[PDB]
Amino acid sequence: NVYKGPASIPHASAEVFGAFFLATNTALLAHMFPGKLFGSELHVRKWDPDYLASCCNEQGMRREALSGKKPNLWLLGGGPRLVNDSWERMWWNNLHWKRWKVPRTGPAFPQDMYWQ
Amino acid sequence: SLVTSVKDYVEITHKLIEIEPLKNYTEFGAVFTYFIFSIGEFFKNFFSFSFLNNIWSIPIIIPDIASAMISEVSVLDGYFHNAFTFLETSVNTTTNPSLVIFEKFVIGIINSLFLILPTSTSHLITLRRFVMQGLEAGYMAGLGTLAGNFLWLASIILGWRFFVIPWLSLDIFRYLLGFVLLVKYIWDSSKERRMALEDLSKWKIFLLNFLLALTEQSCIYPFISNLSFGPDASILEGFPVDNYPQFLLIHGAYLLGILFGSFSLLQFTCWFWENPAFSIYLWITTKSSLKISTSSYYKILNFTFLYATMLCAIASIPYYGLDYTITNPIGLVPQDRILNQKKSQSDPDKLITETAFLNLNPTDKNSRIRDGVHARRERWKQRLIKYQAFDASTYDQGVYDFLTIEDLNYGFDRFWLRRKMRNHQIRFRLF
Amino acid sequence: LQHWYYTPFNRLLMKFDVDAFINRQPKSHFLTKNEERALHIRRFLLSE
Amino acid sequence: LSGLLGDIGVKCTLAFAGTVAAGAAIVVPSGKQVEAASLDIYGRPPSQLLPNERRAAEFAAGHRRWKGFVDNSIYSWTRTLPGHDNPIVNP
Amino acid sequence: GEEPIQDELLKLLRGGWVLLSNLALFLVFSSFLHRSLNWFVQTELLVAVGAPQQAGERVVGKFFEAIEWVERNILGWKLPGDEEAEDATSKVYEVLQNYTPAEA
Amino acid sequence: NNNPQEINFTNPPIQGLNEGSFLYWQTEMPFNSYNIDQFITTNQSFYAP
Amino acid sequence: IVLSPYQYEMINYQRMLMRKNIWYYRDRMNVPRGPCPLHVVKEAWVSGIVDENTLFWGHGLYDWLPAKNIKLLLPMVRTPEVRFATWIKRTFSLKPSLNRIREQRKEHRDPQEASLQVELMR
Amino acid sequence: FGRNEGPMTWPWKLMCAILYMLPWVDVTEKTVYFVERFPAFVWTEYFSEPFEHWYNIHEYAPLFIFFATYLGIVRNKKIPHVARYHVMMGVMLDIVAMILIVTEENLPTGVLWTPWSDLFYALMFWFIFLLVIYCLFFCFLGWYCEIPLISEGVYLQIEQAEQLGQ
Amino acid sequence: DEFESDEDNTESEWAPEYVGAGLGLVAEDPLNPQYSLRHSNHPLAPFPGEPLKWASYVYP
Amino acid sequence: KPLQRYIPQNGGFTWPGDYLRLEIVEMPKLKSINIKKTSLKQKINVQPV
Amino acid sequence: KFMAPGPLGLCHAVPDDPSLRQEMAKVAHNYAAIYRMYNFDWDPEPGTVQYKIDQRIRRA
Amino acid sequence: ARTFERAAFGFAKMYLFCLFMRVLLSWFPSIDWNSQPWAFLRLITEPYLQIYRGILPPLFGQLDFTPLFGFLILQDVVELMSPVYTLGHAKDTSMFWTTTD
Ligand SMILES: CCCCCCCCCCCCCCCCCC(=O)OC[C@H](CO[C@@H]1O[C@H](CO)[C@H](O)[C@H](O)[C@H]1O)OC(=O)CCCCCCCCCCCCCCCCC
Ligand SMILES: CCCCCCCCCCCCCCCC(=O)OC[C@H](COP(=O)(O)OC[C@@H](O)CO)OC(=O)CCCCCCCCCCCCCCC
C-alpha cells in the first residue's frame, strides 16, 4: 500500500539479508569449533597450491626425462631478472611467492578453543 | 608491481647523483615523467604481445663433489661416503603390461567415487537445480562440474605446467572471480526466475559449474573427499614407469577409468532422480512427519539453499587477513620495511598511514590520547590508556615484555585488568 | 572475586568442552600421580 | 554518444587519458638516449647496456626534455612579467 | 526470456565499476580525514585557549602558503629569503661528504 | 652462473659501513664495532670502562 | 576417570598456550618436513604418512619428541572424522598394498615383518 | 506525482556514507572484545577515529544532525527518494545503537562479573557492524536495501515527513 | 607510603642470577634440579614468558 | 622501556644493496663565501670533532 | 615415499644402496635412543637395566 | 529497612522496562491492543502517559513523542533514587585517595 519507491530501481528482499546474517554467524561458529560440525570441519580450499605445483612439476619432469631431454622446473611467481647486483633481486618473484607460505595456508584465527 | 616500480625509481634517482642531482625524491617533474614512462611501457608490453617472451622455467644441474659441501662429505670405513645419488625410481616390470594397465583402469574407476561426493558448493548448486528446475538443469550442472574436474585433473596428472603454474600464480584474481560468480548466482536465484529451459539457459548452467570448478571453493567433510584406494596421499599423484609409451598408456588408462566411473555415476544419478519421483523429498517428509503444504515447502527449501550458498560464498573472509589479500598483490612482503618506516628522523609517526594497523605490539603508544582529541571512551584500558593493551597477533609472530601473556589473554588477570567497564555512573539525560 | 570467578557452576561449558576434547585420546594415556612421579624418577635414574 | 559524455566518470577518464597523452607527447625522447644520455651517464652504447641502465638513460633524456619545455615555454611566458611585489604570509 | 550473455557481462561490469568508484571516493575522503586531524585539533586548541586571533592567523597563513606555492611552482619568479632557507637542510650523502669525519 | 659467463654480485654482500649505512641497518647487524661507537660517550665508556 | 577442576583449568591453560602453534615433524632420513598447521597435521595423519611414533616439534618444547609424548597433540588431531577416515585408509588401502608388496618381493623376510600397519587406526 | 524518483548521485552517496558512519562511532568502544578473536578485522579498531573526533566535538551534535536531516532532507519531496530512504535508515540504525547502549547500561552485576558480558559486548559490535556494511553495499549502489522490522517503518515515516503542516 | 615514599638504590636493585652452564648448584628440590634455574636467563629455565622460537636469520 | 628486537627485515622502498641516500636531515650547510654577521637559524650544536 | 615416517613408508621399497641403508639404520638407532627415554615397561624382565632401577627404588 | 528500598527499586525498574516496551511498540502501528499481552501492557501504562498527553501536545500535530518523554522523565526520577554506593567497583572508592573519590 505504501509507496516503497519506484519499480525501476531494483529492490533487495529481506530473505537475502536474513541469509547473509545467518551465514556470517554460522561461518564464525563453525570456524570457532573445528570438531563439532557433524563430526567434521570447514575447509576453505581442497588442495594447497604448492601441492598442486609440486605434483605438476614432478609429472612434467618425469615426462621430459623419459622423452630424452633435460627437465625444467616451472617457478611460481615468475622467472629471474637479468641483474648484476645482489642475488635476492635476481630471484625476487619466486622469493616473494615463497615468503607468503604461512599466511597463505594457515588461518588467522586461533586453531583451538580457549575459555571453553 | 607498484613496489618494484618504486624501487626502480629510487635506484634511478640514486644513479643521477653523479650527473644531475635532484632536490629530493618527490620532485613533481621526475615523478610525472617516470609515471608517464611506466604507463607507456606497461601499455606497450600489454599491446605488443611481448609478454609471451617471459621466462617461467629453469634447468636444474647437480653440482659435482668438487663444488659441493665438501665439509659434509665423510668417508665411512674407507669404503663408503655420504654423497647419496640413486637413479630416481627403478622398479621391476610386471609379467604383462596389460595386467598393470587393467589394474590402473580399475583403480581409476574406484577413485572416481570421491569426486562426486556431495560436499562442495558445486554439488549444492547441482542439488538445488535438480530439486527446483527439473532434471535437465541438474544434468547440465553435473556435466559441467564433471568437465571442469576432468580438465583440472588431466592438466595436473599429465604435467601441463604451462597452464597450471601461471593460473596458480594469480592468487587474488581466482578468489575475486569466484566471489563474482557466487554473487551473480545468488542474485539470480533470489529473484526466482522460472521459465522453460532453452539451449542458451542450459549452456549458462553448464558454464557456471565449469568456471566454478576452476576456483577454490569451501569444502565440508575433508579427509574423506581426499581419500584414495592406493598407496598415495590423493588422487592426483602419478605412478612410476620405465619409458615414455608406458607412461602414456598407464596415465591414459587411469584418466579413462576416472572419466568412465564419473560418467556412469552421473547417468545413475540422472535416472535415480526420475525413478522414485521428481521431488521425492516431499513424500519422504510426509512419511516422516506432517507436511504443511507445497508452496511453504518450496519457500523453506529455497531459503535453505540461499542460506547455504551464502555461507559457501562468505566462509573465506575471516580466514585471511588484509595483509595477505591487499598488501600482497601490491608487492609487499610480510613484515615489510615500508610498514615501520618513520615519517622523519624527528617525527616518530609512520610514513604510510593507510597501513599503520599492521603488526602492532601491545606496548605501542596509543594515538587517541593526544591533547584535545576527545575520542571514544575506551574504558576497558583505563588503567593502561598509554598503550594498546590487547593482543591480536597471528601465526608465529608475537612479542611480550612487561605486558605478559596471562595479563593480556588469560583468565582473571585479563578480566580484572578491565574492571572499569562495569562501574556505575550518574547521568541525567534531560534535567 | 577471583575465587568466585572459577566457581564450578560458572564453568559448565568449559567442563563439557574439555571432557569432549580429552575423551579423544586413548584410554591408556591417563596416569596417576604416583605413576608420573615414578616415571620421572625412572627417567633421571636411567640418565645417570 | 553524448550520453557517455554526460556521466562524470567518463569525463574524468577522458581528462586523465588526455593528460597522459600530452605528457607522453612532451616528455618521450627519441634518438637522444644514445646521442646524449647514454654516452654521458655510462659512456657505452645503449645496446650493450644492461636492461636496468637503458631505462635510466631514457628517464634522464625525458627529464632533460621536461625541464627544457618547462623553461623555454611556460616559465619565459610567466616570468616576462617581473616580480609583482611577491605577496608573503603575514602571520 | 533469457538475455544474451554479453548483456549480462556489460551489466556486471557497469555495476562493479559504479560500486568500486564510489568506494574509492569514500576511502579517499576517509584518508583525507585521517591525515589532517592534528592540524584541526591544534586550531581548535588555539581557539579554546582564548586566542581566536592566533587561529585566524593560522588559517590565513595556510591560505597564503597555498598562494605562495602557486606563485613559486605554477609561476616562475622566486621569493625573498629562498636562498637563506635553501641552506637550512641537506641530504644524507652531503652530510657524509662535508661534516662526517673519515675515522667513522 | 646462469648465463654462460659468470656474474658477480656487488651490492648484495656489504663489506663496509659508514654513518648513514650504520643508521639504516642499526638493529639488523650481528655485531658493533668501536670505530663508530667511539663517538658516543656512553658507548665509549662501555667499550673502555 | 574423574577429573578435578584443577586438571580442567590446567588443560584449558595449555590449550590457550598452544592454540596458535605451528608444528614440524621429521622423516626417516632425519629431515624436517613442512610447515604444518593443525589441518595439515590431520591430513597427514589420515593419509598414513605420520603416526604416533613420529618426531614432532612445537613452540612449547625444547627438543624433538614422539607425537604421543607431547601433552595435547593426539586429542587435537583425532576428531571422529579423522578416526573414521584413517581406519578406512588403513583397512582398505595400505593393508592390501602391504600384503601385495610382501608377496611380490622376497626381500621382505617373513620371520622379520613390521606391524606398523596393524596399529595405524589408533 | 511531483515527487522526484530519479537515481541518487555520488554526493548523496557520500553524505549517506558519512551519516552511516555514526552508529559505528557509537558502538566503536566494544570492538576489542570481538577483535580478540578472528584478528583479521583488527583494522576495524582504527578506522573511526576522525569520525569519533568530529561527531563528538559538541555534546548536542547528534540531535542537531537528526533535526537537520528529518526536516531539511526527509521532508523535502524534491530530493530523490533513495537518498531520503538511506538517510532515514542511518537515523534508525543510530536509534538501534542507542537502544543497545541503553540496554547495556542496565545489566545486572552477576552478568557483569562473568565472561557472558564479553560475549554481549562482542555482539553489540558485530551485529551493528554487519548492518552498516550491508547498508553500505546498497549505498554505493543506488538500490534499496530492505531490513526486517525497520524498512516498512522507514517507508511510512518518509511519507509522513511529507505533507507536514500542509 | 610503599609505592611513592621508597626508591631502589642503584647497587641494591634486584637482577636475574647468573649461573653460566648451571651445573654446580644447590638443589632446593633434589628430584628436579631444573627448579633452581627459575631466577636466571638460562635456556632451560622454567617458563621464561615467551616461547623459544626456531630462528632462521640471514644478516646483511 | 619496550625491548628492542634485532631481527633482520626484508627490503622496502629500495633494493637490498643500498640505503636512502637522498633523505633530508636537518643540519645547516655552510657557504664558502664569508658571512660577517648572519645567524644560521639553526645552531650546529656540538662544534668540535 | 619410503622416507615417510609412517605406515605409508613400509608399503614402498628402498632404492637398494648400502650407504643409504647404513644411513637409515643410524637414523633409526638415534630415533630408538630418543624413544627409550620416554616409554617404559610396566613389568620389566629380570636382567635388564630398568629391572635393576626398579629394584633399587624399592630398596630405597 | 533494606527490604523496602529493594522492593521499591525493583518495582521502579520493572515500570521503566514496561515504559521502554511501550516506546518500542509505538514504532509498529499494525499491532492490535485487544490481544492479551498488549492489552495488559496498555492497561498498566495508560494513566502515566495519559497525564503527559494532556500536559504536552505534539510538536507539529503529526508526530508523537509522549511515551519517549515519559520514559525519560521516569528514568531521571528513578536515577534520583539510586543507592548511594552501588558496589561493583564504586564501593571500593576507586584506588586510594582520589580526586574523583
Ligand atoms: C608503495 C605503495 C605502498 C602503499 C600501500 C598502500 C596500501 C593502501 C591500499 C589501500 C587500502 C585502503 C585503506 C585506505 C583507507 C583510508 C583510511 C585510513 O587511512 O585509515 C588509516 C587507519 C590507520 O589509522 C592510524 O592508525 C594508527 C595506529 O597506530 C594510529 O592510531 C593513527 O592515529 C591512525 O591514523 O587504517 C585503517 O583504518 C585501514 C582501513 C582499511 C579498511 C579496509 C578497506 C576495505 C576495502 C578494501 C578494498 C580494496 C581497496 C583498494 C585497495 C587497493 C588500493 C590500490
Ligand atoms: C578459464 C581459464 C583458462 C582455461 C582455458 C583452458 C586451458 C587448458 C589447456 C590445456 C588443454 C589441452 C591443450 C593440449 C595440451 C597439449 O597438447 O600439450 C602441449 C604440451 C607442450 O609441450 P612442451 O613440452 O612445449 O610444454 C612444456 C609444458 O608441457 C610443461 O610441462 O605438450 C605436452 O605436454 C605433451 C603431452 C603428451 C601428449 C598428451 C596427449 C594426450 C592428449 C589428451 C587429450 C586430453 C583432452 C583433455 C581435455 C580435458
Ligand SMILES: CCCCCCCCCCCC
Ligand atoms: C601462445 C600459444 C597460444 C596460447 C596457449 C595457451 C596459453 C594459456 C595460458 C592461460 C593462463 C591463464
Ligand SMILES: CCCCCCCCCCCC
Ligand atoms: C544465562 C545468562 C545470559 C545468557 C544470554 C546472554 C547473552 C545474550 C546475547 C544477546 C545479544 C543481543
